[PDB]
Amino acid sequence: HWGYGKHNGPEHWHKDFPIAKGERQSPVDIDTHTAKYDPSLKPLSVSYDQATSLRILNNGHAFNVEFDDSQDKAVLKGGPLDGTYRLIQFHFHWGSLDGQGSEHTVDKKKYAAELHLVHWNTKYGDFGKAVQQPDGLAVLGIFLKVGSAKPGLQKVVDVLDSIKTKGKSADFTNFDPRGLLPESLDYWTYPGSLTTPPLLECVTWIVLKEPISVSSEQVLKFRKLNFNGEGEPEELMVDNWRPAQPLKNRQIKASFK
């Protein structure tokens, strides 16, 4: 039922999912002057050398690149986190135009897209149990701006025409997510939620300050995807982002400057 339109988009989600008006919803605007530098925050540890991608899937709301998360192979730790979080999938949110598409904003600036690398806390055993806990997930968010191509993105772009419509999937082995990371791991962090239903309040957000550049041709290929299934009226998969939500209590912390 839910999606991104006039009649089923973000402003409607609260009717099926009442936490949409909850106390720790994401995304949020990151006011860089109000974020508190915390000298006690550690460097983020991203250990993706043994990642095993398996598949790419059009789920009707974005595309997910899925990983084998049945062993510690691609993990996030350090930063603001206690313990170890396993990579389960990544996906993006993007716009119909280069001036919109990100979910988090920086001093109200929208980026063209935002990558989310989704990890679950191994103390809870599996993703499904982790999402039921306030420290269950750690999502690493990375902004995309349009400029030079990101060579490490091109394998993902080139398989999209094989998963054009909702419910399509393709083998996607040997993809290295290190090729999607900017040079700096400086970050902001705050407690929040999934940004799609069920909107569960289980996420430690870690949002990198430095964007990556992708080319106009690469983000063009994202916008050729479809929200509909095969044999249905074509709905381009664009503007699959939730807008910034009220911060309420919450303090955003910065690992730098």
Ligand SMILES: NS(=O)(=O)c1ccc(CNc2ncnc(NCc3ccccc3)c2[N+](=O)[O-])cc1
């Ligand atoms: N946009 S956002 O805030 O980054 C974000 C929004 C929404 C989700 C929602 N993901 C999932 N929901 C159910 N099952 C899953 N997977 C299957 C599974 C279930 C139980 C145990 C193991 C695997 C996944 N999933 O794979 O991610 C994740 C991240």
Ligand SMILES: [Zn+2]
């Ligand atoms: Zn996301």
